[PDB]
């Protein structure tokens, strides 16, 4: 388990950036959806 914890953060770095993007993405699409609806 100890061996895997060392290399885990190397797997993680590319994936977490992808995650952080998703958070911004989700808020964006919905907000334009509201503008789109009202119009």
């Amino acid at each position: 388990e100890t061996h895997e914890s060392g290399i885990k953060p190397y797997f993680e770095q590319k994936i977490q950036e992808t995650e952080l993007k998703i958070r911004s993405k989700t808020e964006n699409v919905r907000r334009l959806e509201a503008q789109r609806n009202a119009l």
Partner: protein, 234 residues
């Protein structure tokens, strides 16, 4: 204590003083880094020169500082310049920052030269260092014994060598089922993930032959390749 003695010693012209200083700074480079950021262009100049014989160490210091600051891009280039003492980084808890970078850049570059020519290994466009990191990372996966880690990373980079070799070496049939299952996971991924014709087509065709060797193989698995590629001769 402060970096002020340390800085002072670089400046001393005499060879042995500068060398001693490099060791001294190296100890506290991880502990303290914001104080010698100022004075980075000097550490860099020492790395340039080819009078020093701990020259490899001088670039290591520049690299270390740059990752702590958070300029990850500056870190990885300076590290890949020296081609030394990267072994320790891979195997550390703390610094997997520059390890991830070396792996990302490498997968991208490889795919780009893969589309132009199927052979791009032979070209010196791919640096030997870059290579060496990669197969060390295959080394970690297999000790932990989890082959999905090895297969996917390679897959991203259009690395034909690594993929072919993994499937061939799997053939031992310690359990028959286990062989199948790992191959089964690769094919589903390969339709979707890969989009370049040359890589995609080549790995499925190859997969059919490996499976076929086993007499206890599922012809369900073989059937799939044969429909996708739609080649009667198979």
């Amino acid at each position: 204590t402060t970096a002020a003695p340390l800085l002072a010693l670089l400046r001393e012209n005499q060879d042995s003083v500068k060398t001693y200083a490099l060791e001294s700074i190296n100890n506290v480079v991880d502990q303290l880094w914001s104080e010698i950021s100022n004075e980075l262009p000097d550490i860099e100049a020492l790395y340039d020169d080819d009078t020093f014989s701990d020259r490899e160490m001088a670039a290591l210091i520049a690299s270390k500082v740059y990752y702590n600051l958070g300029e990850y891009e500056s870190a990885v280039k300076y590290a890949l310049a020296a081609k030394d003492r990267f072994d320790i980084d891979e195997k550390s808890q703390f610094v997997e920052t520059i390890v991830s970078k070396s792996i990302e850049m490498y997968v991208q570059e490889a795919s780009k030269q893969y589309t132009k020519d199927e052979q791009f290994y032979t070209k010196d466009i791919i640096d030997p260092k870059l290579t060496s990191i990669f197969e060390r990372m295959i080394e970690k996966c297999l000790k932990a014994s989890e082959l999905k880690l090895a297969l996917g990373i390679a897959l991203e980079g259009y690395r034909l060598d690594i993929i072919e070799s993994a499937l061939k070496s799997k053939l031992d049939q310690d359990s028959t089922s286990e062989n199948v299952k790992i191959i089964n996971y690769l094919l589903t991924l390969a339709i979707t993930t890969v989009t370049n014709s040359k890589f995609r087509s080549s790995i499925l065709r190859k997969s059919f032959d490996f499976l076929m060797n086993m007499p206890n193989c599922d012809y369900l698995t073989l059937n799939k390749v044969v429909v996708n590629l739609n080649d009667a001769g198979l």
